[PDB]
Amino acid sequence: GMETLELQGAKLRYHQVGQGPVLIFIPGANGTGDIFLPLAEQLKDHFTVVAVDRRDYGESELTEPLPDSASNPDSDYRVKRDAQDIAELAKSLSDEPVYILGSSSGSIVAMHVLKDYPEVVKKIAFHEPPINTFLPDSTYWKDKNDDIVHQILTEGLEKGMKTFGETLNIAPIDAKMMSQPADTEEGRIEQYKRTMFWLEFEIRQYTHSNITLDDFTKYSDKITLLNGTDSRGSFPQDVNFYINKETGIPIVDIPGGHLGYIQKPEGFADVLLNMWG
Amino acid sequence: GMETLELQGAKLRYHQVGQGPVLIFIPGANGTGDIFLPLAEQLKDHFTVVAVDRRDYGESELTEPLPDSASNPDSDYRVKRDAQDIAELAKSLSDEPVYILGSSSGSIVAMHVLKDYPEVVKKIAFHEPPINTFLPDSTYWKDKNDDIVHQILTEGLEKGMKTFGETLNIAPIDAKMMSQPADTEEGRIEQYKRTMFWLEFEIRQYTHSNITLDDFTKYSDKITLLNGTDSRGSFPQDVNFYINKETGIPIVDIPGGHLGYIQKPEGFADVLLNMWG
Ligand SMILES: *C(=O)N(NC(=O)OC)c1ccc(NC(=O)CCCCCCCCC#C)cc1
Ligand SMILES: *C(=O)N(NC(=O)OC)c1ccc(NC(=O)CCCCCCCCC#C)cc1
Ligand SMILES: [Mg+2]
Ligand SMILES: [Mg+2]
């Protein structure tokens, strides 16, 4: 069982083991304090060992969404909020300044605790910090971090989606429109996030969901299949051809390609009005 | 402003234009109804046009997080919840069954609306559906989808994290341990989410955060820098060497590598006790 400290925007969960002065361990990229529990066992007759799940990880829980801007690479919201969490935790557990150790990005949180809340620090240890900002070659290291994130979060998708368009023989006009970069960096961040979400949570689950031809035949009088005139040869049209061949449900051709409703709204509307008006 | 329907677990936002029978447009991968607004203008004399932001997209908001199982590639949670959202929207706006058009994955949502809530459907259109489940060659298309997601999400991350370890000259013992798949399937999916979160929301923001050398000198007496004995040559140790070079703050060597506190807890503790006990 873990302890809870309720703070602005999160329930902060932590392990607490031992007796003595408070010693707070701040984890790095794993984000959870359980990685310190073997160490806590070694220290528990000397310190009250406090091993934190930082608020975005483990058994901690946000009570309010992150700011939209947190995905921006120069946001400082999260590191400042993590540092304030440690300061409030220290104050909640001790009337004296406490001992603090962070490792990896947890040591960067520790630096911000010292910077913004020196009053809670008795002694502090930075174990293998990967901060580059004050290095004489900061640019070199910053750009490497930026580029490897960009590779995983945006470039893998870009290359895979081009192949996927070929698999499905998507028309070039649709591929260009579906991949057209937004005109702001924030808009582009959001575009890539949305595609990464659709990849993980939508494409497989929806395209192999439990629909049978029998589901259509029960209500065939209500159904129209639509094929774009500018997306001939693409996989979705083959799906409609199969439905039609097996069920007789009609195919209506409609202007534009996969994105025809915004490519050719007037012609698209004219067909819908013919169908249903 | 966008209209709102409050549903279980989400606030569903949608555009509403026109008068006449309700016509609901369900978007595909872009997820948002704004892509139908030029079309809605052509139809607004004949239909009440309703263009939905599906609940995971746009101005719609989840009021509780996605279930953990939504990550499963055969999960039906999201597609069924999207179809129920459309049915509830129809019922909230119309006493009569309504007209519905979906495109791409939005046409799959439309198929589930017809299957599970046929009572809300007057007429329905499936614009370029990419569902494969009932096709004779379903397996070919399913496997292509499974492969492109694995390539972008799993292979992209694995290769990128190996490059990150090389860039920082992480010691082999550390690389192995930090890349070890969890011992429980619950904790493997969580490891993916946690790594992607750290990649997007932590590494760049924290490693280029606002710490200066002068921040260390102000309270230098409080600080210990810690370098692992088994992680020599790695970038985080170079950060500590630079801090030491500029500030005189001592470096203390401690057993293990980057993860030395769990690799060698006894020896790690012995050094902390020498420091602070
Ligand atoms: C329908 O709306 N679908 N699916 C479909 O047609 O069949 C499955 C759909 C699927 C995927 C997308 N978007 C997409 O491919 C764009 C991703 C690229 C983002 C921008 C990257 C720029 C360079 C590249 C490539 C749309 C529709
Ligand atoms: C500190 O704890 N760091 N930072 C550091 O050393 O320098 C910035 C840190 C950084 C990175 C990790 N890596 C890690 O968590 C491994 C992730 C591997 C991929 C996850 C597998 C998911 C499924 C697939 C593919 C640790 C520590
Ligand atoms: Mg790019
Ligand atoms: Mg001793």
Side-chain angles (χ1 to χ4, degrees):
Chain A
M2 318 181 54
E3 304 290 307
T4 298
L5 177 60
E6 182 119 26
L7 306 171
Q8 183 42 260
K11 307 169 265 203
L12 191 76
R13 273 46 187 262
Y14 56 97
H15 306 279
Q16 176 166 347
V17 185
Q19 305 194 12
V22 166
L23 166 47
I24 298 174
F25 287 113
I26 312 167
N30 71 288
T32 57
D34 44 9
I35 200 171
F36 293 106
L37 283 181
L39 177 60
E41 269 322 283
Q42 296 300 314
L43 292 171
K44 63 160 138 72
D45 292 282
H46 295 85
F47 298 95
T48 298
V49 177
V50 170
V52 186
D53 285 9
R54 288 191 284 111
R55 60 164 53 196
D56 288 288
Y57 303 93
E59 296 299 302
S60 289
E61 209 59 67
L62 300 191
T63 59
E64 298 290 327
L66 292 177
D68 285 38
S69 62
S71 47
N72 285 345
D74 64 348
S75 174
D76 67 344
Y77 166 77
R78 281 197 61 252
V79 69
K80 290 305 176 169
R81 188 58 264 201
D82 275 349
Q84 190 184 343
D85 286 352
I86 299 304
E88 289 266 65
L89 183 60
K91 288 177 217 243
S92 86
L93 299 173
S94 178
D95 298 334
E96 227 59 16
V98 307
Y99 296 89
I100 302 174
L101 182 150
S103 179
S104 207
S105 59
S107 75
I108 299 169
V109 175
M111 298 170 177
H112 287 270
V113 174
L114 182 64
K115 172 166 216 169
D116 292 340
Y117 309 93
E119 67 272 13
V120 310
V121 179
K122 187 177 172 180
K123 296 288 195 199
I124 197 160
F126 308 145
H127 179 266
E128 300 206 349
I131 179 158
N132 65 56
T133 322
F134 51 75
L135 294 176
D137 56 350
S138 72
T139 303
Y140 182 95
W141 298 104
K142 177 192 188 275
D143 281 352
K144 288 278 181 163
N145 290 331
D146 291 348
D147 162 277
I148 196 51
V149 173
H150 194 67
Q151 180 184 128
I152 301 168
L153 304 188
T154 81
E155 293 182 346
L157 171 165
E158 274 173 340
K159 287 145 173 291
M161 286 285 103
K162 163 286 280 293
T163 284
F164 197 57
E166 305 170 356
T167 300
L168 272 67
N169 197 36
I170 298 312
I173 188 42
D174 288 315
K176 266 159 208 123
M177 287 192 34
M178 276 167 335
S179 66
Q180 162 100 10
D183 42 55
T184 68
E185 212 64 346
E186 265 165 79
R188 310 215 263 280
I189 289 179
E190 278 311 302
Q191 278 182 304
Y192 291 122
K193 285 164 67 171
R194 168 184 96 231
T195 308
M196 288 291 275
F197 177 84
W198 164 88
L199 268 178
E200 182 171 7
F201 292 99
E202 189 151 309
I203 182 178
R204 292 170 298 177
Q205 294 89 347
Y206 286 38
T207 61
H208 205 65
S209 63
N210 183 18
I211 300 292
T212 70
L213 292 176
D214 194 293
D215 292 322
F216 305 145
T217 64
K218 330 183 199 113
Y219 314 102
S220 70
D221 287 338
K222 314 190 152 179
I223 304 173
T224 304
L225 311 170
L226 294 168
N227 276 350
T229 59
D230 295 327
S231 38
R232 266 135 197 172
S234 62
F235 164 71
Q237 303 215 345
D238 293 335
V239 178
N240 275 344
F241 293 141
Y242 184 73
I243 297 173
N244 166 258
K245 183 176 253 202
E246 297 289 321
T247 73
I249 289 163
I251 295 172
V252 167
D253 293 324
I254 195 160
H258 200 55
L259 270 48
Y261 38 86
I262 194 174
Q263 284 156 1
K264 292 179 169 169
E266 166 163 2
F268 203 100
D270 285 348
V271 168
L272 293 185
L273 285 168
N274 184 82
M275 302 169 29
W276 291 343
Chain B
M2 271 196 102
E3 299 296 293
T4 303
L5 177 61
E6 292 185 32
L7 299 173
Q8 174 71 36
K11 302 175 172 313
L12 193 77
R13 270 52 187 260
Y14 58 98
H15 309 280
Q16 190 174 321
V17 195
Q19 54 144 69
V22 165
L23 167 49
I24 301 176
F25 285 115
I26 311 172
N30 66 289
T32 57
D34 50 8
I35 200 175
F36 296 108
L37 287 181
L39 174 60
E41 283 298 307
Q42 304 291 316
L43 297 172
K44 72 180 183 240
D45 280 349
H46 305 257
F47 299 92
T48 300
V49 180
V50 175
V52 177
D53 281 9
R54 290 193 281 113
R55 60 163 56 200
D56 290 287
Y57 302 94
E59 293 300 311
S60 290
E61 312 169 8
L62 302 186
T63 62
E64 87 201 348
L66 285 180
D68 290 330
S69 67
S71 291
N72 297 333
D74 65 331
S75 172
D76 74 358
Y77 170 79
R78 281 194 62 251
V79 70
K80 292 298 196 188
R81 188 59 263 193
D82 272 353
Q84 196 181 332
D85 284 357
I86 300 305
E88 293 289 331
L89 183 56
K91 295 172 6 180
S92 75
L93 295 179
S94 177
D95 295 351
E96 302 276 323
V98 304
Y99 299 80
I100 295 171
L101 182 147
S103 183
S104 200
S105 59
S107 76
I108 299 174
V109 172
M111 300 171 174
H112 288 267
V113 178
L114 181 66
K115 184 174 187 151
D116 290 333
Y117 308 90
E119 67 274 9
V120 308
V121 181
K122 182 166 187 212
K123 292 289 206 208
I124 198 153
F126 305 146
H127 180 261
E128 299 206 348
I131 183 154
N132 66 56
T133 317
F134 49 74
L135 299 177
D137 57 342
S138 171
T139 296
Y140 167 79
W141 296 102
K142 170 182 190 293
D143 285 355
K144 287 294 183 177
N145 289 339
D146 291 341
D147 292 344
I148 204 71
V149 174
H150 176 268
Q151 170 183 133
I152 295 167
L153 301 187
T154 302
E155 293 182 347
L157 176 62
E158 259 151 2
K159 292 175 174 182
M161 299 298 302
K162 187 166 174 203
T163 298
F164 162 85
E166 286 167 31
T167 296
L168 277 70
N169 291 298
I170 293 292
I173 207 77
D174 285 326
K176 197 191 323 146
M177 168 162 333
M178 281 166 332
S179 68
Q180 289 254 106
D183 78 306
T184 281
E185 184 63 3
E186 214 148 59
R188 305 200 254 291
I189 302 292
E190 225 46 36
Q191 180 180 312
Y192 176 73
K193 295 167 154 113
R194 193 225 325 131
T195 299
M196 304 292 305
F197 177 85
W198 168 83
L199 278 154
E200 175 169 10
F201 293 92
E202 188 153 310
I203 189 191
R204 297 166 298 172
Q205 293 87 345
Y206 284 38
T207 61
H208 205 68
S209 64
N210 179 52
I211 303 292
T212 70
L213 293 172
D214 289 340
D215 294 324
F216 301 136
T217 65
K218 317 246 163 233
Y219 324 85
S220 61
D221 290 347
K222 293 186 165 164
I223 305 168
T224 300
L225 310 173
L226 293 170
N227 278 348
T229 60
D230 298 339
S231 37
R232 312 285 221 227
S234 64
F235 167 77
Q237 300 211 349
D238 288 335
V239 177
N240 275 342
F241 292 135
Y242 186 72
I243 298 168
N244 168 264
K245 174 204 175 116
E246 300 291 318
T247 69
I249 293 168
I251 294 167
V252 171
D253 297 313
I254 195 159
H258 198 53
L259 275 67
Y261 40 87
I262 188 139
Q263 305 162 318
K264 316 246 173 102
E266 69 304 316
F268 203 97
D270 284 343
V271 171
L272 294 185
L273 286 168
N274 289 343
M275 270 152 68
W276 292 342

